[PDB]
Structure formats: C-alpha cells, structure tokens
Amino acid sequence: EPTCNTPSNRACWSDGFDINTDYEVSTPDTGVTQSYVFNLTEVDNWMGPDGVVKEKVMLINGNIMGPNIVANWGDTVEVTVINNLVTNGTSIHWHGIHQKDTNLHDGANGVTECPIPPKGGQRTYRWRARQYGTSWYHSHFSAQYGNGVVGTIQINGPASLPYDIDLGVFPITDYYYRAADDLVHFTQNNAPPFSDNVLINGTAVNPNTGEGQYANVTLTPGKRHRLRILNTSTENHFQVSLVNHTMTVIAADMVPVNAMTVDSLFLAVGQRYDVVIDASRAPDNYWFNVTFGGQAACGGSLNPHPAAIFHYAGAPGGLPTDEGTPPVDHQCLDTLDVRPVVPRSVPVNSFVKRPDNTLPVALDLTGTPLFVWKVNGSDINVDWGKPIIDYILTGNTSYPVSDNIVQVDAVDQWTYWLIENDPEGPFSLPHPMHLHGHDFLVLGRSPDVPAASQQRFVFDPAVDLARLNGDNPPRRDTTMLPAGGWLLLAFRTDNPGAWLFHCHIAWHVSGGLSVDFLERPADLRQRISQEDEDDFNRVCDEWRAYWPTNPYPKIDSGL
Numbered sequence: 001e002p003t004c005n006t007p008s009n010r011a012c013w014s015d016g017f018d019i020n021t022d023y024e025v026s027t028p029d030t031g032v033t034q035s036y037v038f039n040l041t042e043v044d045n046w047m048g049p050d051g052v053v054k055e056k057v058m059l060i061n062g063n064i065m066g067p068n069i070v071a072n073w074g075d076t077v078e079v080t081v082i083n084n085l086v087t088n089g090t091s092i093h094w095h096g097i098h099q100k101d102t103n104l105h106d107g108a109n110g111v112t113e114c115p116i117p118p119k120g121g122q123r124t125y126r127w128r129a130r131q132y133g134t135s136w137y138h139s140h141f142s143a144q145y146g147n148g149v150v151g152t153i154q155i156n157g158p159a160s161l162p163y164d165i166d167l168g169v170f171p172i173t174d175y176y177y178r179a180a181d182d183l184v185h186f187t188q189n190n191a192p193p194f195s196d197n198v199l200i201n202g203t204a205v206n207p208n209t210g211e212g213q214y215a216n217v218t219l220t221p222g223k224r225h226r227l228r229i230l231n232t233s234t235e236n237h238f239q240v241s242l243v244n245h246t247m248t249v250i251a252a253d254m255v256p257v258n259a260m261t262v263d264s265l266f267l268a269v270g271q272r273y274d275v276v277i278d279a280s281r282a283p284d285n286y287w288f289n290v291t292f293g294g295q296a297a298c299g300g301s302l303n304p305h306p307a308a309i310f311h312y313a314g315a316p317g318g319l320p321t322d323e324g325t326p327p328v329d330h331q332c333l334d335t336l337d338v339r340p341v342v343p344r345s346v347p348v349n350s351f352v353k354r355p356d357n358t359l360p361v362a363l364d365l366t367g368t369p370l371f372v373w374k375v376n377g378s379d380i381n382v383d384w385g386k387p388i389i390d391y392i393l394t395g396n397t398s399y400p401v402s403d404n405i406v407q408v409d410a411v412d413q414w415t416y417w418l419i420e421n422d423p424e425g426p427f428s429l430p431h432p433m434h435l436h437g438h439d440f441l442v443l444g445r446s447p448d449v450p451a452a453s454q455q456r457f458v459f460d461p462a463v464d465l466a467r468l469n470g471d472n473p474p475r476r477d478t479t480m481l482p483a484g485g486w487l488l489l490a491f492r493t494d495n496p497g498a499w500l501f502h503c504h505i506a507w508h509v510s511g512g513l514s515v516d517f518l519e520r521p522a523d524l525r526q527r528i529s530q531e532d533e534d535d536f537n538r539v540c541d542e543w544r545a546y547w548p549t550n551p552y553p554k555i556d557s558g559l
C-alpha cells in the first residue's frame with residue numbers, strides 16, 4: 001500500500017517506488033494477499049440488460065461479469081475457480097499479467113494446463129502483481145468468454161499525471177443474443193455477424209424496444225477524473241469519444257505513458273486505456289459515443305448509436321441534447337504515438353527478414369470448414385488432455401505440428417518478429433495480435449491506408465527500415481496487424497515458458513490463428529515448483545477422466 005500518493009502527486013507511491021521505477025524488474029514486498037472465489041454456473045433463459053432473453057450464458061458468481069479484482073502494486077492475487085458448468089471445462093487467463101516465472105498459472109488450456117473439469121472441478125490460481133494499471137481476465141476454453149466468463153483487474157500504483165477521482169473500470173463489450181459455440185460454428189462457414197448491441201459497463205438500451213438503461217457516469221464539476229476504458233469484446237473493435245471533451249491518455253494496456261491529449265481513441269479487442277477527463281465544461285449531460293471506423297473491417301453493431309451518459313453533479317437529469325460531430329475514422333488501427341514513461345531502446349537497422357523470424361498469416365479456404373486461419377502453414381489445435389507443459393515435465397520434445405511451437409532459446413535477449421497479413425491472398429482483414437507473458441515493442445507497420453482498400457504491402461528493406469522506431473516505441477500487450485500489410489514486433493526473452501501469441505478475435509483464434517512461443521525450455525523445467533507440478537497433474541488426471549463422458553466434441557482449436 002502507498003504512503004505518498006495524493007491528488008497533487010500521483011507520481012509517488014512509497015519508499016523506493018514511483019512512476020520512474022522499472023516495474024518489470026523491481027517489485028514492492030507488501031506481504032498482502034487479495035483472495036477471491038469464482039463460481040461458474042450455466043444459466044439458461046437469462047434476462048439480459050436490454051430486455052432480450054439470452055438462450056444460454058455462463059456466469060461468474062451469478063453476475064454478467066466476475067468480481068472486479070483490486071489490489072496494490074506488489075500484492076499477490078489468489079483466485080479459486082470452481083467449475084459448476086454442465087459439460088464445459090474452463091481455464092482463467094489473466095490478460096495483461098506477465099506471470100514472471102509463473103507460466104503454470106497463465107490459464108492457457110492445452111498449453112500451460114488442462115481444463116478444470118465441470119460438475120465441481122476446482123483449481124487455485126496464484127500470481128504476483130508486478131505491474132500497476134488496468135487489465136482483465138477471461139476464459140480460454142475456446143470462445144467460452146463470449147457467454148460471460150469475463151471480468152476486470154485494477155492493480156493500483158502511481159500515475160504520469162495528477163487526478164482527483166479514480167472512476168474505476170469502464171468495460172465496453174459487444175453483445176450477441178446467440179451463444180458462443182453457435183457463433184464459432186457460424187463463423188466456420190460464414191462471415192462474422194454485427195453485434196446485437198454494445199454494452200458499456202454492463203448496460204445498454206435496445207434500439208428497437210427502448211428497454212434497458214444507458215451507463216451513467218457522474219462527473220464532479222471542476223475535477224480531474226481517471227477513467228479506465230476496456231474492450232472486452234470477442235470481435236468488435238471500438239472508437240470512443242465524449243462530446244465537448246478531450247481525453248488525456250496516461251496508460252496504454254498495463255504500461256504507463258506520458259500525457260497525450262486526444263479527441264477520440266481506438267480500442268482493439270483486448271486493448272485498454274487509462275484516461276483523465278477534466279470536468280472543465282458547462283454543467284449538462286454529455287454523450288460518450290461508441291462508433292466504428294475502418295468501414296466495418298473490424299466490426300459493427302445493429303445498435304446504430306451505442307452510447308453512455310456523462311452527467312455533471314448538480315446539473316439536471318434526462319438525456320443529453322447534443323449529438324455532436326462524428327469522430328475521425330481511425331481505420332482499424334491503434335495509435336503509435338504513445339511513448340512509455342519507463343523507456344526501452346532497441347536497434348532497428350540490423351533487422352533482416354529470415355524464415356525463422358517471419359510469421360505469415362493466411363486464410364486457407366481449401367478444406368472443411370471454409371474459414372481456417374493458418375500461421376506459417378498450420379492452424380493451431382491444442383490438446384486439452386496433453387498440454388505443452390506435460391511434454392516439458394516428461395522430457396518429450398516430439399511436439400505435434402498442430403501446436404505451432406516456435407522455440408526461442410535466446411537468453412534475456414531482444415527477439416524480432418515480422419508478422420505478414422496474407423498479402424497474396426484474395427482478401428485481408430485486420431487482426432488484434434496479443435502476446436501472453438510479455439509486453440512487446442511496436443517497431444513499425446505497413447503505411448496507414450483505408451482498412452477496406454485491399455492495398456497490399458510486403459516488407460521492403462530499402463524504404464521500410466527507415467520507417468521503424470527503436471527510440472522508445474509503444475510498449476503494450478495488444479496491437480493491430482494492418483489489413484493486407486505487415487507488423488514488426490520485439491520482446492525480450494526474460495520469462496521462461498510456453499506463451500501464446502494470437503489474434504484476439506474469438507472466431508479467428510478458434511479457426512487456428514495462433515503460435516506458441518516456447519521460450520527457453522530448459523530453464524522452464526528447472527523453474528517449475530513441486531506444488532505447481534503436482535497440481536497440474538492433479539487437474540490433468542481429473543480432466544482426462546472426465547473427457548470420455550462429454551456428450552459433445554471439440555469443434556475448434558480449443559483456444
């Protein structure tokens with residue numbers, strides 16, 4: 001807990017810890033543990049926030065979202081996940097949390113663990129809060145998170161700008177009436193549907209019936225407010241703005257950034273932004289608009305105007321009067337203008353394109369189903385009953401092709417990755433690429449052009465090497481792979497483990513769009529504790545015993 005974090009000095013936290021401290025290598029010892037219990041239940045004919053009854057949902061503790069985890073920088077968070085679903089297994093992934101030397105607690109089923117069996121199966125996740133900011137959690141059992149197994153994480157720590165009130169979490173998500181397994185099945189042979197609605201902090205109004213409620217945020221006149229915006233969607237990529245107000249970015253994902261004032265912000269699936277809103281305008285109700293750019297290349301909604309109300313305290317009630325001007329089209333791309341407070345520097349002149357640093361993404365339509373996404377010639381398909389960690393604990397190096405293992409043996413060195421977005425394919429779509437266990441550096445991408453143009457770019461050293469940035473580029477866990485283009489990333493090999501690198505669009509990862517970075521295998525085995533190993537084997541023995549009794553088959557990648 002803090003000793004010097006005041007509304008005038010958010011930069012200070014405690015003795016020897018501040019905004020300037022390198023959080024990746026230095027963590028405060030608090031000795032405090034914040035514990036929670038996640039009871040997953042399967043509810044049929046559930047009444048949703050917009051009035052429409054959902055066929056089936058999978059909730060945590062009976063609510064639309066799980067409890068918002070709150071702890072301080074340096075604490076340990078512990079969660080006992082109890083699976084009371086009927087047929088489905090589960091695994092909770094702590095998106096944003098690096099799991100430094102705790103790979104076995106990542107929640108990546110078929111990689112770091114076997115799924116927790118239903119009908120009462122349990123497992124206790126435990127991890128250290130070595131990072132401060134806004135993150136989230138979700139299931140990784142195929143597209144199970146689309147049914148409601150989602151929630152937020154707020155690890156308190158210092159900030160890059162002073163503020164008065166911390167308004168907390170603001171998760172924006174797409175909402176479908178059809179269940180996730182039905183949607184994965186539809187997307188296997190058809191183009192993805194637009195969302196039925198878009199929920200903002202758990203609620204939205206039905207554009208047809210008028211039922212529901214708009215999310216209502218009360219701003220205090222003349223005060224600076226911190227808002228933690230999240231995109232917890234399965235496909236929808238958002239654009240956000242507040243009429244007559246600007247937003248000052250103080251963090252991108254779980255990485256603190258220097259103040260950057262904007263009119264609107266693009267949020268890819270899995271992306272987060274901590275912003276400061278100054279209630280500097282006239283007392284009235286203002287609309288917080290959720291819009292779409294990229295000409296529907298990265299999503300859409302059947303609700304033409306998803307919005308929230310930002311009410312000034314003292315002002316009258318009702319709905320806002322000003323509709324405002326439409327925001328600029330972000331073209332399905334996140335901003336590369338954000339510069340981290342704690343800097344990093346890497347050489348970019350030395351990069352050479354080789355098969356071992358290149359990851360070509362492609363859409364294979366030559367099989368059954370039609371929509372099969374491949375990375376380097378293979379669609380990922382993990383084995384829930386024999387995860388990558390089982391191979392490590394037995395000394396087996398015969399990993400099947402389908403696991404998409406990319407073994408990185410480099411010890412604490414910066415590794416380079418060029419991701420290619422099907423430049424020779426019939427068409428290309430933008431993809432929100434996410435990396436487990438690390439924060440990557442966004443070194444550069446193909447020139448920003450309209451997301452629906454179909455303009456293709458292949459990495460040319462003669463012009464693209466000068467377009468790269470190695471002098472403190474954006475550091476985060478999720479960024480956009482441009483349509484028909486390319487993306488150059490770099491991460492330091494400081495965390496031995498099996499880490500997934502995938503597109504966060506549920507339908508795509510289901511279709512196989514992922515690779516598994518097996519980082520320093522030899523170091524990983526030696527760093528696995530007897531408690532972690534014993535428990536992993538307990539859960540795998542229980543899952544392998546349950547599987548033959550399951551009346552349903554695995555229809556996708558399992559991720």
Ligand SMILES: *[C@@H]1O[C@H](CO)[C@@H](O[C@@H]2O[C@H](CO)[C@@H](O[C@@H]3O[C@H](CO)[C@@H](O)[C@H](O)[C@@H]3O)[C@H](O)[C@H]2NC(C)=O)[C@H](O)[C@H]1NC(C)=O
Nearest residue numbers: 055056087088089179180181182183185550552553554555
């Ligand atoms: C996890 O639990 C869910 C919910 O029970 C399971 O989803 C259900 O899966 C079945 C079989 O895939 C679906 O029925 C099938 O639907 C297809 C498409 O319409 C149809 O062609 C088949 O004849 C069959 O009727 C069912 O609709 C679906 N339910 C929901 C709400 O999505 C899922 O299979 C379980 N996952 C695992 C691996 O255990």
Ligand SMILES: *[C@@H]1O[C@H](CO)[C@@H](O[C@@H]2O[C@H](CO)[C@@H](O[C@@H]3O[C@H](CO)[C@@H](O)[C@H](O)[C@@H]3O)[C@H](O)[C@H]2NC(C)=O)[C@H](O)[C@H]1NC(C)=O
Nearest residue numbers: 287288289290291305306307319320322323324325326327
């Ligand atoms: C931000 O969100 C608000 C609230 O959802 C948007 O306000 C809505 O604006 C639309 C027009 O763009 C209004 O609907 C339209 O009404 C006309 C009436 O003649 C009709 O012909 C159209 O077919 C359409 O239905 C709507 O009444 C209004 N919502 C309310 C209740 O105030 C606003 O446009 C959004 N602003 C931006 C820049 O995204």
Ligand SMILES: *[C@@H]1O[C@H](CO)[C@@H](O[C@@H]2O[C@H](CO)[C@@H](O)[C@H](O)[C@H]2NC(C)=O)[C@H](O)[C@H]1NC(C)=O
Nearest residue numbers: 354355356357358359360375376377405406407
């Ligand atoms: C993508 O697959 C290709 C082919 O399977 C890999 O290319 C081979 O890489 C090894 C290791 O460097 C070389 O010894 C071979 O000569 C390469 N074969 C080719 C295509 O000439 C490539 O490494 C894979 N990419 C990644 C990053 O996994």
Ligand SMILES: *[C@@H]1O[C@H](CO)[C@@H](O)[C@H](O)[C@H]1NC(C)=O
Nearest residue numbers: 037039040041061062082084
């Ligand atoms: C989970 O919740 C259900 C319904 O609320 C209840 O029946 C069950 O006992 C709970 N399981 C545990 C162990 O909390």
Ligand SMILES: *[C@@H]1O[C@H](CO)[C@@H](O)[C@H](O)[C@H]1NC(C)=O
Nearest residue numbers: 167168169201202216217218
């Ligand atoms: C989000 O909704 C919750 C309702 O559970 C509310 O307590 C919270 O204040 C809302 N967030 C803000 C500050 O808008």
Ligand SMILES: *[C@@H]1O[C@H](CO)[C@@H](O)[C@H](O)[C@H]1NC(C)=O
Nearest residue numbers: 216218309311316317318319
């Ligand atoms: C929003 O909440 C505030 C605080 O209670 C209130 O003043 C206002 O009337 C509410 N607006 C709506 C549309 O409910």
Ligand SMILES: *[C@@H]1O[C@H](CO)[C@@H](O)[C@H](O)[C@H]1NC(C)=O
Nearest residue numbers: 386394395396397398399400
């Ligand atoms: C290694 O793992 C494979 C699974 O891909 C299994 O078929 C094989 O029997 C194992 N061999 C060893 C080393 O025991």
Ligand SMILES: [Cl-]
Nearest residue numbers: 095096436437
């Ligand atoms: Cl992560």
Ligand SMILES: [Cu+2]
Nearest residue numbers: 095138270504
């Ligand atoms: Cu995630």
Ligand SMILES: [Cu+2]
Nearest residue numbers: 095096435436
């Ligand atoms: Cu993740």
Ligand SMILES: [Cu+2]
Nearest residue numbers: 431503505508
């Ligand atoms: Cu994708």
Ligand SMILES: [Cu+2]
Nearest residue numbers: 093436500502
């Ligand atoms: Cu993942």
